[PDB]
Structures are given as C-alpha cells and as structure tokens.
C-alpha cells in the first residue's frame, strides 16, 4: 500500500475568484508547477454560487470552466479530484441566493434543495465523465460546518437526515464511479470526530463513500494546548487516520488525508517545513493511507482581505510561482515516502460506543480528552497504537483481520481544548 | 416639464444570471426591443457578488461587462441608468461572502464595509464616466430592505447612521455627476413611506440625491384592502409622487417613478393592461415627474424556480420575445403622454410632522390611513391634491413657491393594511 501525494489547488493571483474569468495561461502554469513538485494529483474547488445560481438552472459556462481546469490538470500530468459543493472555503461561505435570507433553507433536509444538489452532482460527473484526468469527486469541502451548532446561519439537520443526505448524493454516482474507475467521497471538518451532539457521525466518514477523508488542522486546540511541535501536534494527522479506522466496517479501508497544512497562527513560519516533514513521517507510519493532499498550492495575494492572516501563508508557491520553504519540504517528503509501507499496528485503544457504533462522548477523543491522550501517550512511547470501538473489542474476526493483539481501556473524560473555528474573530 | 419613459431591464433567457456569461447578441436584441416601444432609457442591475467578491478586490471583468451593457444600450438609442449595489432583486439577496455568516456585518454601519461600497461606487462611475449613454446611477435597488426588522438577516442601523451612509456614498460622486451632466440617486422600497420605526426616513428620499425615487407596488396592502382596480390602487403611484414632495426642501424637485408593475398576485392578468394605462394617466397629472420606468422588460423563463409566481409575468415581452398586452399598454401610454404637462396642484393635505420634519405617525399615510385616504378621495373627486407637512403649512414662502392656495387638515387615523413583503 503506497500513498498518493497531491495538492489542494488555490489559483495563483486571483484565488477562487478566478472562476469569474479564469486566466487559463496562469492556471496552466500553476498546475505545471504543482506537477514539478512530484505531485500525482490536485483537488479543485468550483463555487456553488456560480455553478447553480438558481435552484433549477445550472450554469453551462461554469460546468465548462470546471472541465477546462480538469483538462489542464491532465495536460500537466495530474489526476484531478473535484469537490462539488463549496459551500465553505477558508472561513467564507458561498451559498446561492436561493438558500439565503428570504429563501433561507437547509441543504440537508429541504427536499427541493436535495434534488438540486443531486442535479449538480450528476451534472459535474456527466460533464467530466469522458476526461481521462478526472479521478473522482467529493461531495464538497467540509459541508458539515453548515449544520454545526456553532454556525451563525445554521442549516438544521438531525443525524438520521444527514445519513439520508449522504446516501442520496453518493448513491447517484457510486455505481458509475466504480464502473468507470473513479472515486466518490465526502468531506467533514473535525467536528465529526470531536464535537458532541454533531449531526455528522464518525461512522459516516468511515463507511460511506469509497475512502475516509480527514482534514488535519492543529489550530483546533492541539497546537495551542500541547505545543505546535509537540508529538500531539506533529502526530495529529496520524491520530485522525487511526481514529477514523475504529468506525470503519472495512478493516483495510483507505484513509485520505485530504487536507493538511502548517498554519501560522500556531506554528512558527520557521518551523513549518519541519512540521510538514514530520507530520508526513507520522502519516506514513499508518497502514492503508490513500494519500496526503497538502493545503495549499499558492499563497493568497495580500490584496485580498478578511482572511485569517495565516491563510495567506499556507502556499507551497508564492504569488509569482516561486517555491516556498514549505514547498521544498513537501517536495522532499514526496521523494522520501514514495514507497514507504507501514507495518500493522497491533496495540489498540478502545473507544466506548453505543449500540449503533457511535461514541458515547466525542469530547473524550478531542484534544485534551482521555482517549486523545491515551493514543498520544502510546504514540510517544513508540507503541504505534491503533483504535477500535468497544463493540469490535469483542469480535475476534475483525481483530484478527486487523492483527490487533493488545487492548487498552480508558474511561470517558471530556477535553476542553477543542476550537471549532480557525480564528478568534469567528 | 416632460416625463421620461423607460424600462427596468431584465435580460431575456437567463435573467440576471446572464452576468456570469453574457450573451451579447441576445442582450443587443433585448435592448432593441425596448427601444422599439418608444422608451428613451433603461435601468440595469449588476450583481454585487460578481462585482466585489472580496472586500478589497473589485472584479475588472464584471466592471467591463457593465460597460459593455451600457454601450449596447446607447447603440440601441437608450440612456442607461445603473444601480450600483444589488443587493436585492425580486425577493433574492446577492450579498458577497465577506459580509455573510462567519463574516456577517452591516453595510450601513461597518466602516470597512462602507469603504468597500465607496470603492465600488467610484469604480462603477469611473468605468462608465466616458460613456455617452451613461445617464446616472442609483446606489442600489431598495437597499433599505436589508436594515428593515422584517429582514431575516438584518443589517442594523439607526436613522442617524442611515443618513450618514447615504451622505457618504452620494457625496463621492455628486459633484462629478453635476459637472458631467449625470444624476445620482438612491432607492428605497415603500417602508420608507409606510413603516413606523424604519431607519430610512421620508425626507431622506426627498432631500438626498438629485431626484426622489419611488417604487409603486400595490401588493403592499393597497390592492388587497381597496381592490386591485380601485382608485386607491390605480392612483397609488401618483400618490407616492405627491406624498414624497411634502418632505422635499426643493419645491420643484423631480420625482422618478423608478419601478412600477402590475403584480399578478393582486391584479387579475386580464386587468393588468388597464392598470398600466390608468396608473400612468394618474402619474401624468402630477407636475415635476422625472419619468416612469416600468418593471420589467422581459419575462423570467419558467425554467427558473423560487420566484413568487407573479414575478414571472411582470415582463413587457414574453419568454418567446412577443409583446404582451401590458407591453402594448405601456407602448401606447408612452405615445399618449410624451407631451403631457401637468398643471400645478394647489390644494394640499397636511401631514403632521415633528420639528425634524418626520411624520408623527407613518401608519396614517399608509394604506388604510386617514392621510392616504384623504388624498385618494380628493383625487377621486377631481381636486388634484398635493401634500405638504405641518411645518410647510406655516411657511408662506414655500406655500407660494408651490402655488398652494388651499389646505386640508385631517385627523390622524392609522391604517393597518400595509404588507412589508
Ligand atoms: C469559520 C472557520 O474558521 N472555519 C474553519 C474552516 O475554514 C477550516 O477549513 C476548518 C478546518 O478544519 O476549520 C474551521 O474552523
Ligand atoms: C421579500 C420580498 O417580498 N421583498 C419585496 C421586494 O422583492 C420588492 O422589490 C419590493 C417592492 O416594493 O417589495 C418587497 O416586499
Ligand atoms: Na448519542
């Protein structure tokens, strides 16, 4: 099992505002730059407001521009994954006018909105279905943030409705994807792992869609509470990988670290290269990792305002296309880990779950929680821990299937370090 | 004093979603159709989300597309008025990501947002300043709806802050407009005239900017309470014209009926042509009317969803491009009233106001109110009433300046018909 290595593509010069009038020669250079790092894929992000400005009209020009960006990715030698619904990017919401204010509604429970997102998922897949470089689709970037209790314009949903939303949209394309050789996934931020009462449940990420996605951001309280270059912080992405597997029905389901960056609000810019290198060392020591997709390709121009300041500095390339120090670190990490194979992990911490396989207390596996710290401490001691649920602890078939020979039990104690946002202003 | 006649331009085929990828040959045909009616101007509506996707970046392609649309209006023989901030159109809000949810803010009070709207106003004027067909700008369509308490995502402001917002944005371009021969205006929905407690005040519409704008929509309770083809309904636009003048410092300031339609949620479709004709008859008998701008040019395609159903039928041309019966009525109204000059109105009903010139009770001038009905009843009787405030009533200079020789005082009685949506 060998990891893919890719980059989340932020267009240079105009960011995602480039979709209004893409500068195709710049986008061509951007993607060639990414390929020259040794990346094998990119993840790209069209805007929902431009794709679907009316509930029952999808803009053909927006679809054609997505196709053109995929085409240029292929011409650079990259596989291209497309996120369908943004939705949310870098602290900003892009919600079409037919779901705001006078037309406020929940994308998760309004049947007419669900039908619209279904039409959009089918239109994106159908537009791209003939492209050799089109590698797969994700429903959208961290869509669960819209339903969290923290959201200022929350779209309500209970957990059963979220399950139906995922099943509906994934089920539109899952059969096509498997027959065509493409991937279908969905993406939640870490509230799915950490926030008690959150309507997206851990098993949804680990059982629905073809691969589990995790987005690893140590500004979530981990870097603040333990230190930016602590083992808890450097190992955070590996923790999410191993945590997610506890909730998977498939004992070797791949886990995609679909976004990870070195955020300057907690990690000193001089440490970001080492953070990159050592975070990927830790990821590479987890079996069945689908790939690592760094956030992000290009710095945000300083002309653009209201981003959390660190978001500007996340790029592997600066605004002119020059490689940054983190870019150099990621390039070297790809070369280092192209054929790293991780050995099985055989000591498991046990997460108490209910009869449906859901955590009794997600706060216990959040930064500062008893389960979070049990894993981190076994990790620091060199024991390479994995994670199972209490239900599977009594299932020798799955245990033997994963090669687990030792169990570690701890009680639930909530952590209080978790940050649901990236910046104090939110 | 002669009226201009124009149309609010809704692009055929794709509505304002056309701004994503304008079909310029279709837009050229749209504007040629409008000119063939005998219209002399159009009002057009760029989208804020496309113009200013970041607080400190205005999209040059969006500016250039506005310029191209103005150019084609001129080539069709039309003057083009541009609304800067949409903002709000036909029940939908278009608010950039940097002012919503995690970035929620008030366009009326957040200084950084005010500076962004200032940059956008200057960029629109500067982009269009060399265009012969560019006739003027309005800050945006019914922007006050964002601060109304009825709005589900309200942008708060008190009346003093609204006044400063207007003064700030208008003052950016007012001198340039006067020097270049163009107009600067702002636009509120009728909450400014009717909604007690609303932070936009009547005198703002009648004193700030170069001309008063009124948008006349009888689904506001007038048609429901009196009947869609009652004199109260047919005269509602003329009423807004004459009511607005009471709060104007300038005794001959022009009043622009900048939007008026025959909404099918209260007016039977078979009656809409007569509603058009007779509403304009009443408007044409008010002096100092800048113009009448019908809502709207082209019907919204039935493929588009979530509009109030009546919005689909407001266009003068059908989805196939054929002239509707209301379009024929508007075309004939232009021919009828191109050279109508309204004589002075000399009998005034008096609006009690406080020392700042604000109504003591806006509900009394709202549908169902005593002042609203006193005007409609005098107009129905052929008395051609105008409107002054109680402050005016003890100012012989202004009274003489407007030619007012008779006053009618009426006791305040609140109306209850007003619909804010
Ligand atoms: C409002 C806010 O800051 N949201 C951020 C989001 O932009 C980011 O993608 C995510 C990563 O986990 O973390 C959230 O807290
Ligand atoms: C939410 C809603 O219906 N808003 C409408 C607005 O679209 C219309 O332009 C205006 C005309 O006066 O009346 C408001 O009530
Ligand atoms: Na529960």
d(CA A250, CA A193): 18
Method: X-ray
Q: Which residues of A are less than 8 Å from B14 in CB distance?
A: 57
For helices B111-128 and B60-75, give the axis angle rounded to 10 degrees. 40
A377 CA to centre of own chain: 25
Q: Is A325 in the pocket of ligand 1 (CB under 6 A)?
A: no
d(CA A52, CA A113): 11
In a domain, B82, yes or no: yes
In a domain, A409, yes or no: no
Residue nearest ligand 1's atom 8 by CA = A90
Around Cβ A42, how many Cβ atoms within 10 Å? 26
In a domain, A129, yes or no: yes
Rounded to a whole number of angstroms, the distance from the CA of A98 to the nearest CA of chain B is: 7
The stretches of A338-412 forming alpha helices (DSSP H) are 370-380, 396-402
CA dihedral over A185, A186, A192, A197, signed as positive or negative: negative
In a domain, A108, yes or no: yes
- As beta bridge partners, residue B43 has B8, B81
Could you list the residue range(s) of the whole structural domain that residue B153 is in?
A: 4-337
Check: CB of residue A268 under 8 Å from CB of residue A303: no
The CATH number given to whatever domain includes residue A200 is 3.20.20.80
In a domain, A365, yes or no: no
Check: CB of residue B290 under 8 Å from CB of residue B2: no
d(CA B80, CA B40): 9
B421 CA to centre of own chain: 16
Q: How many angstroms does the Cα of residue A90 sit away from the middle of ligand 1? A: 6
Around Cβ B117, how many Cβ atoms within 10 Å? 24
A193 CB contacts (<8 Å, ≥6 apart)?
A: A202, A214, A240, A243, A244, A362, A365, A366
Q: Flag whether residue B24 sits within 8 Å of chain A, measured between CB atoms.
A: no
Sheet holding A79-83, edge to edge: A183-185, A134-138, A79-83, A41-44, A4-8, A289-295, A255-260, A212-216
**HSE-up of residue B89 (Cα within 13 Å, Cβ side):** 26
Identify which of A107, A108, A18, A110 has the alpha carbon closest to the alpha carbon of residue A68.
A18
Mapped onto helix, strand or coil, the DSSP state of residue B259 is: strand
The DSSP 8-state label assigned to residue A311 in this structure reads G
Q: Which residues of B are less than 8 Å from A306 in CB distance?
A: 54-55, 98, 103
Check: CB of residue A211 under 8 Å from CB of residue A290: yes
Question: Alpha carbon of A273 to those of A42, A85, A203: distances in Å?
Answer: 20, 31, 33
Taking CB atoms and an 8 Å limit, are A102 and B95 in contact across chains? no
In a domain, B244, yes or no: yes
In a domain, A331, yes or no: yes
Sheet holding B41-44, edge to edge: B183-185, B134-140, B79-85, B41-44, B4-8, B289-295, B255-260, B212-216
Check: CB of residue A78 under 8 Å from CB of residue A40: yes
Mapped onto helix, strand or coil, the DSSP state of residue B232 is: helix
In a domain, B303, yes or no: yes
Around Cβ B282, how many Cβ atoms within 10 Å? 18
B171 CB contacts (<8 Å, ≥6 apart)?
A: none
- Phi then psi for residue A10, to 5 deg, are -105, 115
d(CA A281, CA A273): 12
* Ramachandran region, residue B357 (left: φ > 0; alpha: ψ -120 to 50; beta: rest): left
Q: Is A88 annotated as a binding residue?
A: yes
d(CA A308, CA A265): 9
Task: Provide the number of structural domains found in chain A.
Answer: 1
Q: Based on C-alpha coordinates, what's the Rg of chain A?
A: 20
Check: CB of residue B257 under 8 Å from CB of residue B301: no
Taking CB atoms and an 8 Å limit, are B57 and A17 in contact across chains? yes
Q: What is the resolution of this structure in A?
A: 1.8
- By most ligand atoms within 8 Å of CB, the mutation choice from A43, A145, A187, A306 for ligand 1 is A145
Question: Alpha carbon of A175 to those of A184, A209, A210: distances in Å?
Answer: 10, 11, 11
Check: CB of residue A228 under 8 Å from CB of residue A273: no
The DSSP 8-state label assigned to residue A57 in this structure reads B
Question: Alpha carbon of A154 to those of A49, A143, A144, A338: distances in Å?
Answer: 18, 11, 10, 41
**HSE-up of residue A182 (Cα within 13 Å, Cβ side):** 26
d(CA A44, CA B370): 61
Q: Which residues of A are less than 8 Å from B304 in CB distance?
A: 54, 56-57
């Amino acid at each position: 099992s060998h990891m893919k290595f890719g980059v989340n593509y932020t267009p240079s010069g105009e960011w995602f505002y480039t979709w209004l009038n893409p500068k195709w020669e710049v986008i061509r250079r951007d993607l060639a730059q990414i390929a020259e790092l040794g990346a094998d894929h990119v993840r790209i992000f069209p805007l929902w407001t431009l794709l679907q400005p009316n509930r029952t009209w999808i803009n053909p020009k927006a679809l054609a521009d997505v196709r053109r960006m995929v085409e240029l990715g292929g011409e650079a030698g990259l596989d291209v994954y497309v996120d369908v619904i943004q939705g949310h990017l870098s602290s900003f919401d892009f919600v079409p006018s037919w779901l705001v204010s006078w037309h406020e509604g929940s994308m998760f429970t309004d049947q007419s909105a669900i039908e619209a997102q279904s039409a959009l998922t089918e239109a994106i897949y159908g537009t791209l279905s003939d492209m050799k470089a089109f590698a797969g689709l994700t429903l959208g970037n961290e869509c669960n943030q819209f339903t969290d209790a923290t959201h200022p314009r929350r779209m309500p949903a209970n957990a059963e409705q979220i399950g139906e939303w995922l099943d509906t949209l994934i089920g539109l394309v899952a059969k096509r994807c498997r027959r065509d050789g493409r991937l279908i996934a969905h993406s939640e931020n870490d509230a799915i792992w950490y926030a008690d009462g959150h309507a997206f449940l851990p098993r949804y990420a680990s059982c629905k869609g073809d691969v589990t996605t995790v987005h690893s951001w140590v500004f979530n309280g981990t870097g603040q509470h333990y230190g930016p270059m602590s083992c808890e912080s450097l190992g955070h992405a590996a923790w999410l990988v191993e945590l997610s597997k506890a909730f998977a029905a498939d004992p070797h389901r791949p886990v995609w670290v679909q976004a990870i960056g070195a955020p300057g609000n907690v990690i000193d810019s001089a440490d970001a290269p080492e953070f990159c290198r050592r975070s990927i060392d830790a990821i590479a020591d987890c079996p069945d990792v689908f790939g690592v997709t760094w956030w992000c390709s290009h710095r945000i121009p300083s002309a653009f305002s209201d981003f959390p300041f660190f978001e500007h500095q996340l790029g592997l390339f600066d605004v002119d296309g020059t490689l940054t120090d983190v870019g150099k670190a990621f390039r070297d990490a790809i070369a280092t880990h192209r054929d790293t194979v991780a050995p099985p992990r055989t000591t498991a911490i046990v997460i108490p779950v209910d009869e449906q396989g859901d955590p009794l207390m997600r706060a216990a596996q959040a930064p500062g929680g008893s389960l979070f710290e049990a894993w981190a401490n076994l990790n620091r001691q060199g024991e390479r821990p994995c994670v199972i649920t209490s239900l599977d602890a009594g299932n020798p078939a799955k245990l033997a299937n994963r090669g687990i020979v030792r169990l570690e039990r701890v009680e639930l104690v909530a952590g209080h370090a978790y940050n649901a946002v990236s910046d104090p202003a939110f």
